[PDB]
Design an enzyme around this catalytic site. Structure first.
Site, PDB file in Angstrom:
ATOM      1  N   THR A  96       0.817  -1.200   0.000  1.00 39.33           N
ATOM      2  CA  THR A  96       0.000   0.000   0.000  1.00 39.33           C
ATOM      3  C   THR A  96       0.855   1.257   0.000  1.00 39.33           C
ATOM      4  O   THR A  96       1.935   1.268   0.570  1.00 39.33           O
ATOM      5  CB  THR A  96      -0.886   0.006   1.241  1.00 39.33           C
ATOM      6  OG1 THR A  96      -1.660  -1.187   1.239  1.00 39.33           O
ATOM      7  CG2 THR A  96      -1.808   1.205   1.308  1.00 39.33           C
ATOM      8  N   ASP A 133      -3.324   3.990  -3.356  1.00 38.99           N
ATOM      9  CA  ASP A 133      -3.262   3.104  -4.513  1.00 38.99           C
ATOM     10  C   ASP A 133      -4.466   2.117  -4.445  1.00 38.99           C
ATOM     11  O   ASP A 133      -5.333   2.253  -3.576  1.00 38.99           O
ATOM     12  CB  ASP A 133      -1.893   2.415  -4.615  1.00 38.99           C
ATOM     13  CG  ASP A 133      -1.723   1.300  -3.630  1.00 38.99           C
ATOM     14  OD1 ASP A 133      -1.490   0.146  -4.073  1.00 38.99           O
ATOM     15  OD2 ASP A 133      -1.853   1.565  -2.420  1.00 38.99           O
ATOM     16  N   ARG A 140      -4.040  -1.522  -4.863  1.00 36.46           N
ATOM     17  CA  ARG A 140      -3.599  -2.911  -4.765  1.00 36.46           C
ATOM     18  C   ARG A 140      -3.812  -3.562  -3.392  1.00 36.46           C
ATOM     19  O   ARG A 140      -3.446  -3.013  -2.351  1.00 36.46           O
ATOM     20  CB  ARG A 140      -2.139  -3.085  -5.197  1.00 36.46           C
ATOM     21  CG  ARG A 140      -1.665  -4.550  -5.225  1.00 36.46           C
ATOM     22  CD  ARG A 140      -0.217  -4.727  -5.646  1.00 36.46           C
ATOM     23  NE  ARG A 140      -0.062  -4.507  -7.081  1.00 36.46           N
ATOM     24  CZ  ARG A 140       1.057  -4.724  -7.761  1.00 36.46           C
ATOM     25  NH1 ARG A 140       2.133  -5.196  -7.149  1.00 36.46           N
ATOM     26  NH2 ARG A 140       1.098  -4.508  -9.068  1.00 36.46           N
ATOM     27  N   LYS A 143      -9.132   2.349  -0.740  1.00 36.16           N
ATOM     28  CA  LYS A 143      -8.420   2.576   0.506  1.00 36.16           C
ATOM     29  C   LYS A 143      -8.789   3.906   1.179  1.00 36.16           C
ATOM     30  O   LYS A 143      -8.460   4.083   2.354  1.00 36.16           O
ATOM     31  CB  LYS A 143      -6.900   2.438   0.292  1.00 36.16           C
ATOM     32  CG  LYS A 143      -6.516   1.126  -0.363  1.00 36.16           C
ATOM     33  CD  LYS A 143      -5.049   0.902  -0.334  1.00 36.16           C
ATOM     34  CE  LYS A 143      -4.731  -0.336  -1.116  1.00 36.16           C
ATOM     35  NZ  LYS A 143      -3.266  -0.517  -1.332  1.00 36.16           N
ATOM     36  N   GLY A 181      -2.427  -1.880   5.794  1.00 38.41           N
ATOM     37  CA  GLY A 181      -2.114  -2.988   6.696  1.00 38.41           C
ATOM     38  C   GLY A 181      -3.028  -4.169   6.461  1.00 38.41           C
ATOM     39  O   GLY A 181      -3.317  -4.514   5.321  1.00 38.41           O
ATOM     40  N   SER A 232       3.503  -0.061   2.813  1.00 36.56           N
ATOM     41  CA  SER A 232       4.769  -0.610   2.318  1.00 36.56           C
ATOM     42  C   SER A 232       5.492   0.291   1.334  1.00 36.56           C
ATOM     43  O   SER A 232       6.693   0.122   1.137  1.00 36.56           O
ATOM     44  CB  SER A 232       4.596  -2.013   1.744  1.00 36.56           C
ATOM     45  OG  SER A 232       3.550  -2.053   0.794  1.00 36.56           O
ATOM     46  N   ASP A 261       7.167   0.119  -5.151  1.00 33.35           N
ATOM     47  CA  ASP A 261       6.809  -0.885  -4.153  1.00 33.35           C
ATOM     48  C   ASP A 261       6.060  -2.066  -4.785  1.00 33.35           C
ATOM     49  O   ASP A 261       5.034  -1.874  -5.445  1.00 33.35           O
ATOM     50  CB  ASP A 261       5.988  -0.237  -3.039  1.00 33.35           C
ATOM     51  CG  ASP A 261       5.490  -1.206  -1.995  1.00 33.35           C
ATOM     52  OD1 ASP A 261       6.233  -2.139  -1.649  1.00 33.35           O
ATOM     53  OD2 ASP A 261       4.345  -1.056  -1.545  1.00 33.35           O
ATOM     54  N   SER A 269       2.372  -2.432  -3.844  1.00 30.27           N
ATOM     55  CA  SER A 269       1.569  -1.307  -4.328  1.00 30.27           C
ATOM     56  C   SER A 269       1.465  -1.320  -5.845  1.00 30.27           C
ATOM     57  O   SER A 269       2.416  -1.652  -6.558  1.00 30.27           O
ATOM     58  CB  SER A 269       2.192   0.032  -3.934  1.00 30.27           C
ATOM     59  OG  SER A 269       2.280   0.223  -2.538  1.00 30.27           O
TER      60      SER A 269
END
Ligand SMILES: *[B]([O])([O])[C]([C]C1=[C][C]=[C]C([C][C])=[C]1)[N]C(=O)[C]([C]C1=[C][C]=[C][C]=[C]1)[N]C(=O)C1=N[C]=[C]N=[C]1
Ligand SMILES: *[B]([O])([O])[C]([C]C1=[C][C]=[C]C([C][C])=[C]1)[N]C(=O)[C]([C]C1=[C][C]=[C][C]=[C]1)[N]C(=O)C1=N[C]=[C]N=[C]1
Ligand code: NA
Lengths: 241, 242, 240, 219, 199, 204, 236, 229
Positions: D1, D17, D19, D33, D47, D129, D166, D169
């Protein structure tokens, strides 16, 4: 504290439980509600007390409650008390189903609620539930069944019964016209209207429901007002002739 | 008003009264007189402790208690209720030190204990305390402080105070004193004089005088008035009566 | 005005749908003997009550009916003194608890609604009696300006332009409505209206030790209790 | 994320994002999100997706009860406190890392709330992340009092740096602008990957699958 | 973190760096660790961020109600006992150190240590990961009778000295001067820090 | 892993006006196969089905505790549940056991009461809802299923096209999974009818 | 009439009739006398028999090595209070390894017995005790009642006809401190016998004695063990 | 507390405390609910004792959630208890089902709490009857819940002082096909039948519910409705 206690769970000098007896009086004031067992099904016919012109009529019924896939019930007494009991009936039926993975047999559902009603007469110091119930159903042990239970937690199986207003007159009237074993949903529906006519007749003032067996599955259906009208005029015709 | 309106503390009478609290206040009024005086450098307590029997020990039924090292309590009313309030007051002071690390301020203790008293004036389940009491304290920071709580749970701060049979008679005598400018050594002699004056030698039997004080002279500690000073105050009290 | 059963002893309905025990709690407020007035101004809110200290044996500073609930909220209690202290302790608790959970100071109305809701419980449960007291709260709202709220032993609560409680409540309200009907509601006009309401209704020409005044200002929202010299400065200007 | 926040001249921008990953496998290419708390308060979750979903849902529901009772717009301090005291009580076992942004009577505010219940009031922040890729863009080009167009641009870039840098992500950049007049939920504001095209000829002729049993229930 | 408090005639000076880390990662580079517990009572936060903020929130709440009941500003000893009791009761589950300093009408300016539920009054005190490298410095540099300015200079120098050496400390130094008159807030930026040998 | 003790796979796929749901039929403990007709897809309404992969006790337990709440819901509400609402009912049931969960990863496939709009979703073992507009997978062969679904799935598939696609994606995925198989069952849920088919699949 | 039923009800006179009714239990138990010298505390009590065939009830019970009691009232409440006292004493020796100071034990009885005087549906204890003890402050005689009030006594008597015994203790009060054990016990016996009818005297069947002091632990003398003390009595 | 019921059956079979609670309702300020074809109106008499009362400070017409609203007759403080409980119950449903609570469902849940106070120990029934309005499954709802715990679905109804007259007035005056603009006017005319004095936008309170949810009408909106009356 002792001063304000009503003493609802105590015996009177003649071995009577007065709150239980006063609860029954409440049921006599409630609308007439009768049940009739037949060979091809079982029915519930109740008087409607919410009979004002400005009522919305949002729900499918007023007094008829589905409990299980195979069972339904009708009430006579304090309607808010009846909401508690019908909701508890639905929870008992699902606790049985979760455990055995079979629907609760009719008599067992009635006994379970009657054990809660009885507890209100023996302990807790609370007033009882002011409700009498008529239960209709089907199970793999005794087929089509009709029960009745009063505020005392006492119950019984019946071939025809009545609770609510003029219950006494309706049971004497059902006693004469009921042909044990030779009854069908068609003849019993005629008898249901014949009785309610004398103990009270628009399709707005009545409310009928039937429980039948179609293709190995139980079918519970509250009859439409037009259906009830056709049943009332088929009796209105026979009364004039 | 004997019509059911007076059997419970959770019941108001039609004129807006709680008779159970009023009847509990009557238990204090029937009891022996206790007085407390606040002066320039401390607080002094005196109690008319009636001698019910010659058989009892000197110092039996002490109506004066140490609620904390700096706090004293003078009682009038039903003694077992009064001693139960002393234990509450004690624990309240004990809990303040455990929470904040210093001696409980007297108005705060008076406020806390007065609400344990108030609590017993709301329910059918419990009975109001048949007791009134005074709390005395002295510190450099807070000065001299005298408070009184009644069965209703009311707490007020006082310059002079009396509770019991002769509450009003002792008040008209404390009013004669200019305590705001007096010492505890001076006020002790006067407390004894006031207790002997309001005592009823005809209606009541013999009495024993209890004297306690907390002030600059004691370093803010609640103490009994030593035998030496007590004898001197009792001598003046008897000599003044003549 | 009928009775049946224990309807005059406990909080259960009477045949007419009344709660006699709650009605009696309103009569308990008058048992205290005092009267209280609260007036709201253009940019202030003032509370004033009697200060009866009969014996010089009392410490006059401990005899009070005005209380600080929070830094910006104050109150005037009318009725049974210990019942009043009890309600002030709970008001203080509820307010401190509110800031702890929500991170912002409790609004005057929310503290009133809260105390009123607590008071309602006593009105419905039979094992305890209502409190024989009336709470009036003042404070300056960030977006609503000066607030005056009052709650009953009945559990009712409301906001007011001006209000009264106690022995001469009805007369004080009759007077307060006559002055609000006809002024620039300045701090002096709000303070004086409150002092001369208590004075004309009780028929007492006050001395600075006979009354206690409490105020919240838009310029200084902290609840401030007036000195005897400050009370005198208003009393003398009223006589002029 | 990669979740991010910004405080500009007229409000707050929140970026996220799309994902959701289940152990190195992309489970969802476009999840949401950015969650609603109140009309002018939104929250980004990163998380354990169930923990972020349920702790956002609970505080939004608590803020409706708050606002209904008070009759006022909720404060961003209240959502921060309600969230922290709940997360602290669970001692980090509720794995929700949140970016709370919003506008109340006291202006626009941006907060970072961590799973153990710690918080910070920040002018810009990034969690997840991919937070370091976003936090690098924010540090590199944040200036106070940015214009809405300038702030949106920086936020999109910050989330995009995380999307491409990432592995945890990806997807699109969802955004939310919150101003004194309300919030504009800009879903899929940016798509750093152009529509994926294949020459898919995976048609199966009816009957190719061998069927052993067939029952038809009319409805 | 590097926290520090110093007593003087009319009150206290409290300082802290501004770094919030999560491993080797700086999460917040401008955090103010000087949290008010009352008007004229503050605490310096260190250790677990979640634990330190929780204890501070509870201590400020307990002290607010305590102050309103005594109709007086709480004593700094009472505020120190408040924090201390929470830190002591929960010492197995908490991993935070909250230094408590401020001012009183009674005992004036006082500095307290709360480390692991203990209570100690100090002429000056230091805490946090950064304090380990400035013990020798504060032992050499502290002199009694320091003015509020001298206290701010002692606090700024000691915290900058620790900030340089400690990876978990850095950013800006937040200064707070509690006195009878009120509280003063200073911020020494990362550009304006005092300079010493840094090679 | 706990989820691999019993094995199995479940899958759902969208269609233009239809939805599909499929699962394998193995019931085995570790490397030993016990039965070849284990039920993993349960009807929740006329056009609403739920498929459960993972630990066989919790597949049976979650389905039964869910049917309990569903029956009560329809009795109180007087209506058949909407597909999205069933997802929220499973999320709440699973999240109740957040810190000691049921080892099941559901998949929901149904049609909106507007007798049309297909709905597919999946929930993780702690009840995290995930709606997709294409397919959802859950099982020991989720990597295999994603590969087959990603390659085979097309947007507005007719029921016949949907059947061939979901059948081929299940068969080829579970044929590369040691603890999944023993046959495949597929339900095609259209407005007018449900078609249930068991495929001729490998038996090893 | 209405103020008789519960302990939580205050009468309009500021009286609690239930407490007063419980005290009537003490006055109806048989006489007991407790008295003390500079070194000893004595308990002397009359034991009633429920018939010639029944035995004379145990009026004196052990509490600890330094404390003993004599009861008057509800025997079941006396057992309840005895076990509380015995236990409080055990706690003190377990925790502190020293006897529980007698005045401290008596405060716990007053604190313990006040609780049911202020709680609805609860009742006061229908027991009154005379406590004999010895500690760092020498010997003690205490008196507890169904009203949770307690008294420090030089000598005392509770129960049926106890007024007659009280009068002897008040008249001979001055001689008690310098009394030896034989004389102190005889003083106790004379006060006890003053309650007894004119036709009735003391007996090695109806007399019970309890002694605690400087070197003696609490000891109970009942029948032939009582004989040496009765062998000194001489008149009326 | 008191563990025994305070509402019991009289020898004639009546739950007299519930009958006495209904009397409290019948003596309260009047309230009206009208189910229009495209919405629902809730109207009440908000006339306070004097000018000194800040009318704008407390409300009778209250929101429960975005799509449900409420009004009452009877005991004001009792109502507040049910408002909080109803708002809480509406959030519990939304948290589980992620869908706005159906009005029949809210009314049923709230009515259960009312039944509880008729049987649970040491409490009296609520002295309040609530009119609940909502919008769900694209259609309007109007319910009433009384002190026994019984609920009723109405097309239009009146509560409180002069409810018998208002209920006959509503029956004859209007019927189905009402636009919400027509229904608000009728609700205010029903209230004018009992009202003593000049009816202003500060002594009456109106709330509406439609496709856009439930909201309380502003005094300026009420003023324009009163301009036509
Ligand atoms: B993110 O990558 O950290 C993401 C956050 C997320 C995902 C979906 C929906 C929301 C709404 C609040 C938030 N978390 C995940 O992808 C997690 C796994 C994870 C955990 C920690 C770091 C990186 C990734 N995935 C799930 O919890 C999950 N995945 C699919 C379906 N349900 C849940
Ligand atoms: B400091 O380094 O001790 C700092 C002090 C602190 C106290 C209260 C509030 C905050 C910010 C919200 C900070 N604490 C930290 O930086 C700790 C890590 C730490 C602890 C001890 C020594 C060195 C570093 N930060 C956290 O615990 C934390 N912060 C953000 C995200 N997760 C955890
Ligand atoms: Na009550």
């Amino acid at each position: 504290s002792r001063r304000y206690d009503s003493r609802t769970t105590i015996f009177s000098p003649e071995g009577r439980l007065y709150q239980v007896e006063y609860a029954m009086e409440a049921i006599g004031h409630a609308g007439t509600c009768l049940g009739i067992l037949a060979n091809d099904g079982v029915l519930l016919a109740a008087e409607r007390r919410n009979i004002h012109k400005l009522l919305d009529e949002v729900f499918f019924s007023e007094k008829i409650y589905k409990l299980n896939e195979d069972m339904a019930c009708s009430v006579a007494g304090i309607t808010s008390d009846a909401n508690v009991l019908t909701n508890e009936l639905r929870l008992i039926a699902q606790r049985y189903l979760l455990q055995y993975q079979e629907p609760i047999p009719c008599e067992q559902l009635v006994t379970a609620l009657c054990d809660i009603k009885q507890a209100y007469t023996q302990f807790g110091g609370k007033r009882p539930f002011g409700v009498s119930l008529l239960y209709i159903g089907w199970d793999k042990h005794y087929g089509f069944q009709l029960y009745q239970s009063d505020p005392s937690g006492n119950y019984g199986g019946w071939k025809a019964t009545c609770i609510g207003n003029n219950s006494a007159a309706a049971v004497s009237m059902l006693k004469q016209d009921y042909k044990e074993g030779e009854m069908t949903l068609k003849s019993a529906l005629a008898l249901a209207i014949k009785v309610l006519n004398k103990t009270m007749l628009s399709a707005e003032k009545v409310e009928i429901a039937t429980l039948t067996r179609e293709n190995g599955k139980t079918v519970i259906r509250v009859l439409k007002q037009k259906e009830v009208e056709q049943l009332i005029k088929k009796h209105e015709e026979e009364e004039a002739k | 008003i004997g019509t059911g309106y007076d059997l419970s503390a959770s019941t108001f009478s039609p004129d807006g009264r709680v008779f159970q609290v009023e009847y509990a206040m009557k238990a204090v009024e029937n009891s022996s007189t206790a007085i407390g005086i606040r002066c320039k450098d401390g607080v002094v307590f005196g109690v008319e402790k009636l001698v019910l029997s010659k058989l009892y020990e000197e110092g039996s039924n002490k109506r004066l208690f140490n609620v904390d090292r700096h706090v004293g309590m003078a009682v009038a009313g039903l003694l077992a209720d009064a001693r139960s309030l002393a234990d509450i007051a004690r624990e309240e002071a004990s809990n303040f030190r455990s929470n904040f690390g210093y001696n409980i301020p007297l108005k705060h203790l008076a406020d806390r204990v007065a609400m344990y008293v108030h609590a017993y004036t709301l329910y059918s389940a419990v009975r109001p305390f048949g007791c009134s009491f005074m709390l005395g304290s002295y510190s450099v920071n807070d000065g001299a402080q005298l408070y009184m709580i009644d069965p209703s749970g009311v707490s007020y701060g006082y310059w002079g105070c009396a509770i019991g049979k002769a509450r009003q008679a002792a008040k008209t005598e404390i009013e004669k004193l200019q305590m705001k400018e007096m010492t505890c050594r001076d006020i002790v002699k006067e407390v004894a004089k006031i207790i002997y004056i309001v005592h009823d030698e005809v209606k009541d039997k013999a009495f024993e005088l209890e004297l306690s004080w907390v002030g600059e002279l004691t370093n803010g500690r609640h103490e009994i008035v030593p035998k030496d000073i007590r004898e001197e105050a009792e001598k003046y009290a008897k000599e003044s009566l003549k | 005005g009928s009775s049946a059963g224990f309807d005059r002893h406990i909080t259960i309905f009477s045949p007419e749908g009344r709660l006699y025990q709650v009605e009696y709690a309103f009569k308990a407020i008058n048992q205290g003997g005092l009267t209280s007035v609260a007036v709201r101004g253009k940019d202030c809110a003032v509370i004033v009550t009697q200060k009866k200290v009969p014996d010089k044996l009392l410490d006059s500073s401990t005899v009070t009916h005005l209380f600080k609930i929070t830094e910006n909220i104050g109150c005037v209690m009318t009725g049974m003194t210990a019942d009043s202290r009890s309600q002030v302790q709970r008001a203080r608790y509820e307010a401190a608890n509110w800031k702890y959970k929500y991170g912002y100071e409790i609004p005057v109305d929310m503290l009133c609604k809260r105390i009123a809701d607590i008071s309602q419980v006593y009105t419905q449960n039979a094992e305890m009696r209502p409190l024989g007291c009336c709470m009036i709260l003042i404070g300056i709202d960030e977006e609503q300006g000066p607030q005056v709220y009052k709650c009953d032993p009945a559990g009712y609560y409301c906001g007011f332009k001006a209000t009264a409680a106690g022995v001469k409540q009805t007369e004080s309200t009759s007077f307060l409505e006559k002055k609000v009907k006809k002024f620039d509601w300045t701090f002096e006009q709000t303070v004086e209206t409150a002092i001369t309401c208590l004075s004309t209704v009780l028929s007492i020409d006050f001395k600075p030790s006979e009354i206690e005044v409490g105020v919240v200002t838009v310029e200084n929202p902290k609840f401030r209790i007036l000195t005897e010299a400050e009370i005198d400065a208003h009393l003398v200007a009223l006589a002029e | 994320t990669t979740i991010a926040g910004l405080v500009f001249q007229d409000g707050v921008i929140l970026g996220a994002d799309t994902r959701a990953t289940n152990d190195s496998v992309v489970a969802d290419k476009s999840c949401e999100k950015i969650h609603f708390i109140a009309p002018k308060i939104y929250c980004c979750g990163a998380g354990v997706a169930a923990d972020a979903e349920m702790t956002t849902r609970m505080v939004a529901s608590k803020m409706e009860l708050h606002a209904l009772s008070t009759g006022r717009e909720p404060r961003v301090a209240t959502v921060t406190r309600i969230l922290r005291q709940t997360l602290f009580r669970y001692q980090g076992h509720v794995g929700a890392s949140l970016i709370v942004g919003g506008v109340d009577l006291t202006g626009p505010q941006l907060y970072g709330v961590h799973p153990h219940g710690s918080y910070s009031r920040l002018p810009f922040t990034a969690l997840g992340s991919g937070q370091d890729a976003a936090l690098a863009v924010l540090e590199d080009r944040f200036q106070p009092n940015m214009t809405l167009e300038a702030a949106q641009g920086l936020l999109v870039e910050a989330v995009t740096a995380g999307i491409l840098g990432d592995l945890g992500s990806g997807g699109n950049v969802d955004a939310c602008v919150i101003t004194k007049t309300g919030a504009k939920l800009l879903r899929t504001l940016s798509s750093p990957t152009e529509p994926v095209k294949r020459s898919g000829r995976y048609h199966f002729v009816p009957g190719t699958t061998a069927v052993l049993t067939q029952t038809v229930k009319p409805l | 973190t590097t926290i520090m408090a110093v007593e003087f005639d009319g009150g206290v000076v409290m300082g802290s760096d501004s770094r919030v880390s999560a491993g080797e990662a700086v999460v917040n580079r401008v955090f103010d660790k000087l949290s008010p517990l009352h008007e004229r009572i503050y605490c310096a936060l260190s250790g677990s961020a979640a634990d330190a903020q929780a204890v501070a929130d509870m201590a400020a709440y307990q002290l607010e109600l305590h102050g309103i009941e005594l109709e007086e500003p709480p004593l700094v000893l009472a505020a120190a006992n408040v924090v201390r009791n929470i830190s002591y009761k929960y010492r197995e589950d908490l991993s935070a150190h909250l230094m408590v300093a401020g001012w009183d009408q009674r005992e004036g300016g006082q500095v307290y240590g709360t480390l692991g539920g203990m209570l100690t009054r100090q002429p000056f005190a230091i805490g946090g990961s950064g304090s380990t490298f400035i013990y020798g410095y504060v032992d050499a540099a502290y002199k009694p009778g320091m003015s509020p300015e001298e206290c701010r200079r002692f606090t700024t120098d000691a915290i900058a000295l620790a900030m340089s050496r400690d990876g978990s400390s850095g950013g800006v130094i937040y200064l707070v001067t509690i006195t009878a008159a009120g509280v003063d807030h200073r911020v020494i930026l990362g550009n304006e820090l005092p300079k010493f040998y840094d090679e | 892993s706990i989820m691999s003790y019993n094995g199995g796979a479940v899958m759902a796929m969208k269609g233009k006006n239809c939805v599909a749901i499929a699962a394998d039929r193995r019931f085995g403990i570790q490397a030993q196969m016990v039965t070849t007709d284990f039920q993993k897809i349960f009807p929740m309404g006329d056009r609403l089905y739920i498929g459960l992969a993972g630990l066989a006790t919790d597949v049976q337990t979650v389905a039964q505790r869910l049917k309990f709440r569903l029956n009560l819901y329809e009795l109180k509400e007087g209506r058949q549940i909407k597909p999205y609402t069933l997802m929220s009912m499973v999320a709440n049931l699973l999240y109740e056991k957040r810190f000691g969960p049921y080892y099941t990863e559901p998949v929901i496939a149904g049609l909106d009461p507007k007798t049309f709009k297909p709905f597919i979703c999946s929930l993780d073992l702690i009840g995290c809802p995930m709606v997709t507009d294409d397919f959802v997978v859950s099982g020991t062969c989720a990597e295999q299923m994603y590969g087959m679904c990603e390659s085979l799935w097309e947007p507005n598939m007719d029921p016949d096209h949907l059947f061939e696609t979901i059948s081929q994606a299940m068969l080829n995925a579970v044929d590369r999974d040691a603890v999944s198989g023993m046959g495949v069952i597929v339900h095609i849920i259209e407005k007018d009818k449900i078609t249930t088919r068991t495929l001729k699949a490998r038996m090893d | 009439n209405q103020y008789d039923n519960d302990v939580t009800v205050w009468s309009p006179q500021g009286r609690i009739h239930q407490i007063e009714y419980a005290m009537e239990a003490v006055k109806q138990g048989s006489a007991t006398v407790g008295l003390k010298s500079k070194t000893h505390a004595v308990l002397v009590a009359l034991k009633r028999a429920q018939s010639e065939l029944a035995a004379h009830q145990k009026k004196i019970l052990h509490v600890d090595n330094h404390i003993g009691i004599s009861i008057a009232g509800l025997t079941a409440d006396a057992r309840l209070l005895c076990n509380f006292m015995r236990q409080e004493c055990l706690d003190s020796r377990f925790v502190f390894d020293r006897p529980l100071p007698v005045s401290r034990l008596v405060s716990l009885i007053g604190s313990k017995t006040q609780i049911p005087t202020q709680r609805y549906g609860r009742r006061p204890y229908g027991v009154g005790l005379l406590i004999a003890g010895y500690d760092d402050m020498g010997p003690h005689i205490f008196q507890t009642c169904p009203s949770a009030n307690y008294f420090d006594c030089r000598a005392m008597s509770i129960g049926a006809r106890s007024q007659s015994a009280r009068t002897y203790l008040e008249r001979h009060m001055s001689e008690f401190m310098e009394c030896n054990l034989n004389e102190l016990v005889k003083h106790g016996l004379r006060a006890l016998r003053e309650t007894l009818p004119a036709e009735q005297d003391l007996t090695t069947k109806n007399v019970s004695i309890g002694i605690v002091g400087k070197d003696l632990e609490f000891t109970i003398y009942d029948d032939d063990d009582v004989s040496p003390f009765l062998e000194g009595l001489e008149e009326r | 507390g008191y563990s025994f019921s305070l509402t019991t059956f009289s020898p004639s079979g009546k739950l007299v405390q519930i009958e006495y609670a209904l009397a409290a309702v019948a003596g309260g300020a009047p309230s009206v609910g009208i189910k229009a074809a495209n919405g629902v109106v809730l109207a009440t008499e908000k006339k306070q004792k004097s000018i000194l009362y800040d009318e704008r400070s407390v409300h009778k017409v209250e929101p429960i959630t975005k799509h449900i609203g409420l009004v009452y007759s009877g005991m004001g403080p009792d109502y507040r208890v049910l408002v909080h409980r109803a708002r809480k119950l509406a959030q519990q449903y939304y948290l589980v089902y992620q869908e706005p609570i159906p009005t029949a469902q809210l009314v049923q849940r709230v009515a259960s709490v009312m039944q509880e106070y008729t049987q649970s120990g040491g409490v009296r029934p609520f002295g309040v009857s609530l009119l609940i309005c909502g919008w769900n499954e694209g259609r309007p709802y109007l319910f009433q819940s009384d002190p026994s715990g019984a609920y009723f679905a109405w097309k239009a109804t009146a509560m409180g002082k002069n409810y018998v007259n208002g209920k006959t007035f509503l029956e004859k005056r209007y019927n189905e096909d009402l636009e919400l603009e027509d229904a608000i006017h009728t609700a205010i005319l029903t209230l004018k039948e009992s009202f003593e004095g000049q009816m202003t936008e500060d002594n009456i309170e109106v709330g509406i519910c439609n496709e856009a949810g439930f909201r309380r009408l502003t005094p300026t909106e009420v003023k324009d409705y009163l301009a036509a009356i």
